[PDB]
């Protein structure tokens, strides 16, 4: 169904420790396909997925060229914001930039966005309409007035609705075997006595893709969202994902509690329960 391409830029000043570190990473939905590391030896946008490697030399010359320029801009930006906030050249600060486009089943532009942050906090974001900006504070306001006069939103827009989707469609096609598949979650359940009086039921879900998924526990057809442990969805590392949800129940009710798996990768929701 829906698809997206997102890029993430992180710059961290390092007073005394030399010039700032600039790291970049490209994601097509839940798959990273490229990266750039101002510290590495290559100094080239590098591939991080099989399907993207097939792009030719001029693609990589272009990405490295455009990424270098992007890091130079964030390097000056780093010293500029230090001033806007009257900080010393002693601490290390960070600038984060994330932007991308979303397309629906027919690969037609759906949503587009761009947001920048300073020291983990919002700085300036492009509005939903892709025509104006939203500044977080007075320092960000300086940048806003300028970007509005320099027509920055228009360049961002022409890209989000244009090349951004153009490349997402080409990526979704050149790497179908990875990007368009849907790996359903291989379920399973475990029980661990806590005591002769209580025990823990853990609902597993490994090797699934995309990451989107929902594990929920129920009391005879009643969901219990406040006595159940649930961890953050995590990367197995092979490209797939995993997750589990737990619950603590009396020594006699392990047939009153059902766990439901839901993932676009499986025709019908699962209703696991111990035995």
């Amino acid at each position: 169904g829906s698809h997206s391409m997102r890029y993430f830029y992180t710059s961290v000043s390092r007073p005394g420790r030399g010039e700032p570190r600039f790291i970049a990473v490209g994601y097509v939905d839940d798959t990273q396909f490229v990266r750039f590391d101002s510290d590495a030896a290559s100094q080239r946008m590098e591939p991080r997925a099989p399907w993207i490697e097939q792009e030719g030399p001029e693609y990589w010359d272009q990405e490295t060229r455009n990424v270098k320029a992007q890091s130079q801009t964030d390097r000056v930006d780093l010293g500029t914001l230090r001033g806007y906030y009257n900080q010393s050249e002693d601490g290390s600060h960070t600038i984060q930039i994330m932007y991308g486009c979303d397309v629906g089943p027919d690969g037609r532009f759906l949503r587009g966005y761009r947001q920048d942050a300073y020291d983990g906090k919002d700085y300036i974001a492009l509005n939903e309409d892709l025509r104006s900006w939203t500044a977080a504070d007075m320092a960000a306001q300086i940048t806003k007035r300028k970007w509005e006069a320099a027509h920055a939103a228009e360049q961002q827009r022409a890209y989000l609705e244009g090349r951004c989707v153009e490349w997402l469609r080409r990526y979704l096609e050149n790497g179908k075997e990875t990007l368009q598949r849907t790996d359903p979650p291989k379920t399973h359940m475990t029980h661990h006595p806590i005591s002769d009086h209580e025990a823990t039921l853990r609902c597993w879900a490994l090797g699934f893709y995309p990451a989107e998924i929902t594990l929920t526990w129920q009391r005879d057809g009643e969901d219990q969202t406040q006595d159940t442990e649930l961890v953050e969805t995590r990367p197995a590392g092979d490209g797939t994902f995993q997750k589990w949800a737990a619950v603590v129940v009396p020594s006699g009710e392990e047939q009153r509690y059902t766990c439901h798996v839901q993932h676009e990768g499986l025709p019908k929701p699962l209703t696991l329960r111990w035995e």
């Binding site: 992180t10 961290v12 983990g120 475990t190 490994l206 995590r234 590392g237």
Partner: protein, 100 residues
């Protein structure tokens, strides 16, 4: 100057099985600033060869990283993740509970 502690999760890629090669994982996320020391441990000691994923972040701006190294389980061996962050009074040690 926003400071956020990292959530740590220690687990294997594939279901644990003695003798059968696998990968040890340490998934740290939700922290800020970016700096972070992470080591994977084999019986209190530190596993030399450990690769990590490229620095990225979620929408709330917090960073997340994945560390991993090849390993083959054994009924006897104790594996764990050691994370250090400016947000920690000291190193946080999470031991790998396979079954779980």
């Amino acid at each position: 100057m926003i400071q956020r502690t990292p959530k740590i999760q220690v687990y294997s890629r594939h279901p644990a099985e003695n003798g059968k090669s696998n990968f040890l994982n340490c998934y740290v996320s939700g922290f800020h600033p970016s700096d972070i020391e992470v080591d994977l441990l084999k019986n209190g000691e530190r596993i030399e060869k450990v690769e990590h994923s490229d620095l990225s972040f979620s929408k709330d701006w917090s960073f997340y990283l994945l560390y991993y190294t090849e390993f083959t389980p054994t009924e006897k061996d104790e594996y764990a993740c050691r994370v250090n962050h400016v947000t920690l009074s000291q190193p946080k040690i999470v031991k790998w509970d396979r079954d779980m």
